[PDB]
């Protein structure tokens, strides 16, 4: 709506915004993240992973 400028979704973090100069609505998404795991057969057998 015209008076609204931000968006907070369910939690307190902002997920949408309004560009001041062009009055456009932009969705914001977090950058990619995740864990990294190493599968080894054992140093005794080999050194490949």
């Amino acid at each position: 709506l015209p008076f609204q400028q931000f968006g907070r979704d369910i939690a307190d973090t902002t997920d949408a915004v309004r560009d001041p100069q062009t009055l456009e609505i932009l969705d914001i998404t977090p950058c990619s993240f995740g864990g990294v795991s190493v599968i080894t057969p054992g140093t005794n057998t080999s050194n490949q992973v």
Binding site: T13, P30, F33, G34, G35
Partner: protein, 48 residues
């Protein structure tokens, strides 16, 4: 999005369903003999 991740389980639902079907088919065809050792066939009325 705050470092919270959900990991998938090792056994998919199809694998668990296959286990259940193997147990139930073994029961209705061999009785209780497949638990002790090799499965041995017996007609159902005789088992009951």
């Amino acid at each position: 999005f705050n470092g919270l991740t959900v990991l998938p389980p090792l056994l998919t639902d199809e694998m668990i369903a296959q286990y259940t079907s193997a147990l139930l088919a073994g029961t209705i065809t061999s009785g209780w003999t497949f638990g002790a050792g090799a499965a041995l066939q017996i007609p159902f009325a005789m088992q009951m």
